[PDB]
Design a protein around this nucleic acid. Structure first.
Ligand SMILES: [Mn+2]
Length: 190
DNA sequence: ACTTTAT
DNA sequence: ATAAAGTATAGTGTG
């Protein structure tokens, strides 16, 4: 099976929808009886929005005096998953351990306190995690600095290896893959 | 590399 | 006027 890891940039304007989705605050593929099986791997407070948690953290820690820009990438939400075959082979403890391990990889490489949320979804087709990583380093908030072309190349190589080194039977995606990302809605059509 | 943003 | 960070990136699956 392939390691699936892929980030989407979240601005203020889409962290609302990310929070509502992830916290399940009635789509064909959500099974509502399974929603209570979901879990959050960070110690974050569930009544506090992603926008508020991240902006407070960045404002309280940033070196510059200038306001966070309105078009700022406040976090990179990584989807961490694999195929169905992969998870069918794992019990509950193992499944949890898989996401905790992936969370660890981003914590150890990008900063423990940058993992704003790690929301594991079992109530959809395949187990996966939405993991918000704040691109905050050296007192600066910059997805441009943290996730650039070489860094995404490095993660596609080194993350699947790290996961494999930690117990999990997963291979990296195809090096130089020509695939174009489809949205969930676009992938469903196909 | 070029453009937007907040000084 | 300035300069940091905005723009995609790399990967596969029914996020
Ligand atoms: Mn989900």
């Amino acid at each position: 099976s392939y390691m699936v890891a892929r980030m989407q940039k979240m601005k203020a304007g889409n962290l609302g929808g990310a929070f509502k989705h992830n916290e399940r605050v009635s789509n064909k593929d959500i099974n509502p009886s399974r929603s209570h099986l979901n879990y959050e791997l960070t110690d974050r407070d569930r009544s506090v929005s992603y926008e508020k948690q991240i902006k407070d953290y960045v404002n309280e820690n940033k070196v510059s005096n200038r306001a966070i820009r309105k078009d700022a990438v406040l976090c990179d939400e990584w989807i961490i998953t694999s195929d169905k075959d992969f998870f069918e082979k794992l019990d509950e403890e193992q499944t949890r351990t898989f996401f905790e391990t992936a969370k660890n990889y981003f914590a150890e490489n990008y900063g423990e306190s940058n993992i704003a949320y790690a929301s594991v979804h079992l109530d959809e087709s395949t187990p996966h995690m939405h993991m918000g990583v704040v691109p905050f380093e050296n007192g600066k908030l910059s997805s441009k600095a943290m996730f650039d072309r070489e860094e995404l190349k490095h993660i596609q190589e080194d993350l699947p290896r790290y996961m494999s080194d930690h117990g999990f039977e997963l291979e990296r995606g195809k090096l130089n893959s020509e695939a174009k990302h489809k949205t969930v809605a676009e992938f469903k059509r196909a």
